[PDB]
Amino acid sequence: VSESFVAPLEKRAENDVPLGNDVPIIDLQQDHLVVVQQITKACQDFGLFQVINHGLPEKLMAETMDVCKEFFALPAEEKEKLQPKGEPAKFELPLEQKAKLYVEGEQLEAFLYWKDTLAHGCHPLDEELVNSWPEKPATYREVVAKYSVEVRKLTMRILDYICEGLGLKLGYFDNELSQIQMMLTNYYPPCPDPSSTLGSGGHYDGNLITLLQQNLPGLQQLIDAKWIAVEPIPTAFVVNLGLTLKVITNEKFEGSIHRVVTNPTRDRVSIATFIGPDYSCTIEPAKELLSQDNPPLYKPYSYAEFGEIYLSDKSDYDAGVKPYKIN
Ligand SMILES: CN1[C@H]2C[C@H](OC(=O)[C@H](CO)c3ccccc3)C[C@@H]1[C@@H](O)C2
Numbered sequence: 001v002s003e004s005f006v007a008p009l010e011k012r013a014e015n016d017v018p019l020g021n022d023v024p025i026i027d028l029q030q031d032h033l034v035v036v037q038q039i040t041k042a043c044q045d046f047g048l049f050q051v052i053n054h055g056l057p058e059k060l061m062a063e064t065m066d067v068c069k070e071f072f073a074l075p076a077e078e079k080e081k082l083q084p085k086g087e088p089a090k091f092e093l094p095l096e097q098k099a100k101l102y103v104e105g106e107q108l109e110a111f112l113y114w115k116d117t118l119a120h121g122c123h124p125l126d127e128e129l130v131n132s133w134p135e136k137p138a139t140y141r142e143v144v145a146k147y148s149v150e151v152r153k154l155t156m157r158i159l160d161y162i163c164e165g166l167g168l169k170l171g172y173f174d175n176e177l178s179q180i181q182m183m184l185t186n187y188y189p190p191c192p193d194p195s196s197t198l199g200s201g202g203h204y205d206g207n208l209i210t211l212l213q214q215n216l217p218g219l220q221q222l223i224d225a226k227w228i229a230v231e232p233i234p235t236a237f238v239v240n241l242g243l244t245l246k247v248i249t250n251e252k253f254e255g256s257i258h259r260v261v262t263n264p265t266r267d268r269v270s271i272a273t274f275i276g277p278d279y280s281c282t283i284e285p286a287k288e289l290l291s292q293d294n295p296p297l298y299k300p301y302s303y304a305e306f307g308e309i310y311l312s313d314k315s316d317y318d319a320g321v322k323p324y325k326i327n
C-alpha cells in the first residue's frame with residue numbers, strides 16, 4: 001500500500017481479534033421496564049450494544065444498504081460532483097449538511113484512513129437539504145429520506161429509554177442536543193496490506209449517539225487495551241454512545257471507543273447515523289443528576305470549540321474534552 005495509508009506501529013490491528021461475546025444484543029420488543037434496564041446496564045458498563053426487533057423496517061434497511069452500495073459503485077465522473085474543488089472534503093468545522101465525499105486521517109506521524117465517506121445532514125428534511133444530496137442513484141433521495149426519518153424515530157426511542165434509566169424527564173434530548181443528524185456512508189475498499197492500515201482509527205463518536213448499520217465484519221471495540229470484534233447482524237443497529245453523552249451523564253454512562261480494520265478480499269459499506277447537538281450548543285453534566293456525592297467532572301463548554309479539537313487532535317480518544325475536565 002501507499003505510505004500515505006501506513007498507520008503508526010502502535011495503532012496497527014492484530015490479525016486475530018476475538019468476537020465480543022459479551023456485547024449486549026437488546027430485544028426492544030421485551031417488556032418496557034426490561035428494555036430500560038438492559039439498555040441502562042449496557043450504557044453503564046459498555047457504551048456499545050446492538051438493538052433487534054427495533055421497529056425499523058428490515059426491507060428499508062436492505063433498500064438503504066443497496067442504494068449506498070450502488071452510490072459507491074458509481075464511476076469517477078459522478079463521484080467528482082461531490083468533491084469540492086476536485087478533491088474530497090475534510091472533517092473540519094464548518095461541517096456543512098450538503099452531500100460531500102470526505103477523506104480522513106490523523107496528524108500526530110500523519111496517515112490516512114483506508115475509507116471513503118459520503119456525509120450529509122438529514123434533519124430537518126426540507127427540499128433545499130434533499131436537493132443537496134446525491135443525484136445518483138435515482139432512488140437514493142427517496143430511500144434515504146425514509147431511512148433518515150425511521151433511524152431518527154428509533155434513536156429518539158432509545159434516548160427516552162436512556163432518560164428513564166438516568167431519572168431524566170422523557171424528551172430531555174428532544175431539543176438542540178439532537179438537532180444535527182449526519183448520515184455517514186462509509187466505503188472500505190479491499191486493502192492489499194490489512195496489517196499496516198486502518199479503515200477507521202480508534203475513536204469515540206464525538207456527538208450524542210450514533211446508530212450503525214453493518215452486514216460484514218471489521219468493526220472492533222476497545223474494552224486493558226483489549227480490542228474485541230462486534231458481530232455483524234445485518235438487521236440490527238449497533239448503538240454507540242458518544243463523548244457528548246458521556247459528559248452529560250457525568251460518566252455514569254461509557255462512550256464507545258471503536259475502530260474499523262481493512263479486508264484484503266472484499267469491500268464493505270457501513271451506514272452511521274450521527275445524532276447530536278447543534279454547533280451553537282453548550283455541553284455540561286445534566287444539573288438534575290449532580291450532587292455533593294456526584295460532583296460535575298466537566299465544566300460547561302462550547303460544542304463548536306470541542307468539535308475543532310475533536311476533529312484535529314487525535315493524541316488521545318478524549319482529547320476533545322480534556323480541556324474541560326474538573327474535580
Ligand atoms: C471516523 N471519524 C470520526 C470523527 C469524525 O466525526 C464527525 O465528523 C462527526 C460527524 O457528526 C462529528 C461529531 C462531533 C462533532 C463534530 C463532528 C469523522 C468520522 C466519524 O465516523 C467519526
Ligand SMILES: O=C(O)CCC(=O)C(=O)O
Binds near residue numbers: 212219258259260270
Ligand atoms: O464502519 C463501521 O463499522 C464503523 C463506522 C464508524 O465508526 C463511524 O462512522 O464513526
Ligand SMILES: [Fe+2]
Binds near residue numbers: 258
Ligand atoms: Fe464511529
Ligand SMILES: [Sr+2]
Binds near residue numbers: 080083086087088
Ligand atoms: Sr478528484
Ligand SMILES: [Sr+2]
Binds near residue numbers: 131132133
Ligand atoms: Sr443539487
